[PDB]
Amino acid sequence: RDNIQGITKPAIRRLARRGGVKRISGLIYEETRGVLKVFLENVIRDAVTYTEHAKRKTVTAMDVVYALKRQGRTLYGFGG
Amino acid sequence: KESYSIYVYKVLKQVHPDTGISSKAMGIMNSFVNDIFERIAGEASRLAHYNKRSTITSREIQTAVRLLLPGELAKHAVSEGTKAVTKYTS
Amino acid sequence: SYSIYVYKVLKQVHPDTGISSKAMGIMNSFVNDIFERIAGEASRLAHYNKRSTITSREIQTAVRLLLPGELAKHAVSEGTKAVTKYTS
Amino acid sequence: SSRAGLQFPVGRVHRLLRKGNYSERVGAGAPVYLAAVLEYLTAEILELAGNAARDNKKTRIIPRHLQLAIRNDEELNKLLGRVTIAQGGVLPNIQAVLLPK
Amino acid sequence: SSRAGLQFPVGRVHRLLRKGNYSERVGAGAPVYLAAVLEYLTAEILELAGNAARDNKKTRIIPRHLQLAIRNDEELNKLLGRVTIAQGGVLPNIQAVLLPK
Amino acid sequence: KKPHRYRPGTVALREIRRYQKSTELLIRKLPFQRLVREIAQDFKTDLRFQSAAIGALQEASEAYLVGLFEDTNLCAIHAKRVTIMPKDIQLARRIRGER
DNA sequence: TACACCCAAGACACCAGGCACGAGACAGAAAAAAACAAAA
DNA sequence: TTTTGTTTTTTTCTGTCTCGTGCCTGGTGTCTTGGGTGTA
DNA sequence: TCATCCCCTTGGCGGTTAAAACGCGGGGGACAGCGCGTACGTGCGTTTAAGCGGTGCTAGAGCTGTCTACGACCAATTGAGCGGCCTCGGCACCGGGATTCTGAT
Numbered sequence: 001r002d003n004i005q006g007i008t009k010p011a012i013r014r015l016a017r018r019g020g021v022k023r024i025s026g027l028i029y030e031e032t033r034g035v036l037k038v039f040l041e042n043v044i045r046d047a048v049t050y051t052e053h054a055k056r057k058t059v060t061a062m063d064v065v066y067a068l069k070r071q072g073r074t075l076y077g078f079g080g
Numbered sequence: 081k082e083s084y085s086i087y088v089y090k091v092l093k094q095v096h097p098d099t100g101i102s103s104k105a106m107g108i109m110n111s112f113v114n115d116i117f118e119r120i121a122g123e124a125s126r127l128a129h130y131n132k133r134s135t136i137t138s139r140e141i142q143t144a145v146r147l148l149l150p151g152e153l154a155k156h157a158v159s160e161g162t163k164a165v166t167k168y169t170s
Numbered sequence: 171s172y173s174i175y176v177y178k179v180l181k182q183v184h185p186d187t188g189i190s191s192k193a194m195g196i197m198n199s200f201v202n203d204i205f206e207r208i209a210g211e212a213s214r215l216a217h218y219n220k221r222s223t224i225t226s227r228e229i230q231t232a233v234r235l236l237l238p239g240e241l242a243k244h245a246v247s248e249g250t251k252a253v254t255k256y257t258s
Numbered sequence: 259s260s261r262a263g264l265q266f267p268v269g270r271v272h273r274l275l276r277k278g279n280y281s282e283r284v285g286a287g288a289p290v291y292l293a294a295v296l297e298y299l300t301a302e303i304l305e306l307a308g309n310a311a312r313d314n315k316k317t318r319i320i321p322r323h324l325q326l327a328i329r330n331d332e333e334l335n336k337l338l339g340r341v342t343i344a345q346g347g348v349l350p351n352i353q354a355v356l357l358p359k
Numbered sequence: 360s361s362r363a364g365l366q367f368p369v370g371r372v373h374r375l376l377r378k379g380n381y382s383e384r385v386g387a388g389a390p391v392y393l394a395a396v397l398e399y400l401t402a403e404i405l406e407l408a409g410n411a412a413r414d415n416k417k418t419r420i421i422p423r424h425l426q427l428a429i430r431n432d433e434e435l436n437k438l439l440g441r442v443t444i445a446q447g448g449v450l451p452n453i454q455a456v457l458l459p460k
Numbered sequence: 461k462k463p464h465r466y467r468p469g470t471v472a473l474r475e476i477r478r479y480q481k482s483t484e485l486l487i488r489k490l491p492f493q494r495l496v497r498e499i500a501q502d503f504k505t506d507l508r509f510q511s512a513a514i515g516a517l518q519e520a521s522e523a524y525l526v527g528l529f530e531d532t533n534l535c536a537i538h539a540k541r542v543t544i545m546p547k548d549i550q551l552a553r554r555i556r557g558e559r
Numbered sequence: 560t561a562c563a564c565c566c567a568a569g570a571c572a573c574c575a576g577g578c579a580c581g582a583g584a585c586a587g588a589a590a591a592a593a594a595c596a597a598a599a
Numbered sequence: 600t601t602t603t604g605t606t607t608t609t610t611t612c613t614g615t616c617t618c619g620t621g622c623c624t625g626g627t628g629t630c631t632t633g634g635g636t637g638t639a
Numbered sequence: 640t641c642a643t644c645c646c647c648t649t650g651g652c653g654g655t656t657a658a659a660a661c662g663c664g665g666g667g668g669a670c671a672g673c674g675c676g677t678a679c680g681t682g683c684g685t686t687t688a689a690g691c692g693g694t695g696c697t698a699g700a701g702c703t704g705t706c707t708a709c710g711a712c713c714a715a716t717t718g719a720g721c722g723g724c725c726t727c728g729g730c731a732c733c734g735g736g737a738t739t740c741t742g743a744t
Contacts, residue, residue, distance in 0.1 A: 122280070136281045141288045141295070
C-alpha cells in the first residue's frame, strides 16, 4: 500500500544528478514519482498481457523485454 | 489492384445513409485500414512466435487488439470480435 | 546463442581482452535485434515486389536502409565479399 | 461475411493473412476477429467524420473532416499519434499567451 | 561458415530465417550476407569496447565499456538511438552554464 | 574557527560527476520491487516475478528517468534558469510525444 | 500427453448486384448589400 | 464620438449525388477427408 | 492380529542496523520594475517566376511467352557445443600516502 513513496527524495536526487541536474526544486519529486508510476503501469500492463497470453503465472524477463520493445524502449542484456 | 473502398462505403451507408465520401478521404481510410491490418498481423505473428506456435487463432488477434488499441477502443473491439466469432461459429 | 561466435570475434579483434556475462548478454541481444530488424525489412521488401524468395539483394537493401552511411557501406562490402567467397 | 454479420470480407482477410508471411497456419476465428475489429474502427471513424461533415454543412467526407474527427478524440489520436493525414491540416488551437489582453 | 570465411554460423542463420516466417523461399546468399553483416557489426562494437576498456585500464569488457563505445560513435548512436543498455550509465556531460562562473 | 562549509553548487556538481562516472542502480531494490508487485497486483492478482524481469524493469525505468531529467535540465537551461521545474518536465513529455 | 470429432480447403456447378458510363438535379461558395456590439 | 471587424439576408451557377443500366466476378449449395483443438 | 509440582519445548513481546525530515544559519537570483535599443509591421511601388493551357518528344515498366537451375525433400554420414568438471586469476574492499579545489585572510 502506497508503495509509490518508495522512490524517496534521495533516489530522485541521484537520478537527477546522473542526468546532469544541478539544482532541484520541491515540486519536482512528486511529478517525477507520478511519471515513473505512469511509465511502470504502461509497461506492466503489456507485461501482464504477454504473460496471460502464454497461460503463465510468472512474469519472466522475456515478457518485460517484449513489452518494452513493443512500446519503444529497446533493452539489452536480458534475453538469456 | 484490390481495395476496401466498397466495404468502407457500405459501412458509411450503414452509419450515415445520407453522407458521401471523397476520393482522398477514401484513400486515407484505405491507408488506415491497411496500417491497422499490418499492425495487428505483426503483433499476432510476434505473439505466435514467442509461444512457439505456428497457428494464429482468435486469441492472438484479441491479444494484439488489447496491446495496440487503448482502453475503451480495445474493449469495444474485443467485444465486437467475440460477437462476430460467436455468430460465425453458430 | 551467439556466445562462442562473439568470443571468437573479440579474440580476433582483441587477443588480450575478455568479456563478462552481462556484456555477452548485451551483445547477444544486439545481434538478435539486428537479425530481427534485417529479416523484417527483407520480408517487407520481398512482399512489396511480389516476390516469395529472399536473396542477397534483399539483405543488402535492408542493410542500406537500416545502417547509416559508412556503416552501411562497410557492411554491404563485407556481405558482398562473403557472398562472392561462398559462391566460388 | 454474411454468417458473421460483418460487411468487411472474411475470405480476403484470410488470404492476406495466409500470404502475408505471418504464420504457417491461420485459424478460422482470427480473420473473423480481425474483420470485426476493422469494421468497428471504420464505423467509429466514419460516424465521427459524418458528424464533423454535418457540422460543416456538407454531404461528403473530406480529409479535413477526418482530421477534425480523429484529432478531437483522445483514444483515436493516441492510436494514430505517429500518423500524418494528407490535406487534413491541424486543430485550430491558439495559446492563451498569444491572445490580446 | 568455412567456405565464406566468417565466424558467425551460416546454417543457424539460415534455419532461423526459414523458421521465422519471413518468406516462402530463402536463397543461399541471404544467410551468408546477414551473417557477414552481423559479424562486421559485432567486430566494430567489440573493437570500440576494447578500446574504451584499454582507455580505462581494464581487461574485461563491461556494460559501461559498451555504453561508452556506442554513445561516443555517431553512427552507432544513430543506429541504436532507441536502445537502452543495462548497467551502462550515460556520458559524463556537464553543461557550461552549470559550471561556477 | 568556523567549520568548513561548501557553497551552493560545489557538492551538486561533485555528485553529478560521481553519478555520471558510475553506472550503479540509484533506486533501491526492495521499494522498487514492492512498487512493481503492487502495480502488477492491480492488473492480475497472485503474480510471480523473476529477478531478471525486475532487474530489467528497474534498468529501463532508471534509463527513462535519466533521459527525462536530461530533457528537463535542457528545458530549464533554455528558460535562463538553473533549478528544474515541473513545467520543464511537462514540456519535455509533450515534445517527446508522451502527452 | 491421448482419444475423439467436426467444419474448412479443395473442387464442381449455379447464380446476382458492383461500377463505371451519363444525366437531371441539389445544397452551397460567391457576388453583394445591409446590418449590430466591440475594439481601437 | 467615428471608423472597422463580425454577422444575416436575395439569387445563381457549380462540383457534385443518386438514379438507369449491362458484364461478369466474385456471391452460394454439395461430396471428401482430415488435421487442429475439446476435453480429459 | 484388529491428579499437584515441575523440566522444558512451541507461541508472541522485546532489541540494533545505515541515511534523511525537522531545526537552523543564509544567500544567488526569479520576479517585477527602470531603462536603453533597433528590425521590421504595415503600407506602397515595382518586378517576376509560378499557374494554367497547351504543344511536341521520347523512353521504360506492364504484361506476355520461353527457357532454366538452385530450392525442397529423401537416405547415409559426421562433427564440436552443452552440460558438466576442473583450473586459474582481476579487481572491490582495506588503509595509507600523495594530490587538490575552495573558502577565509
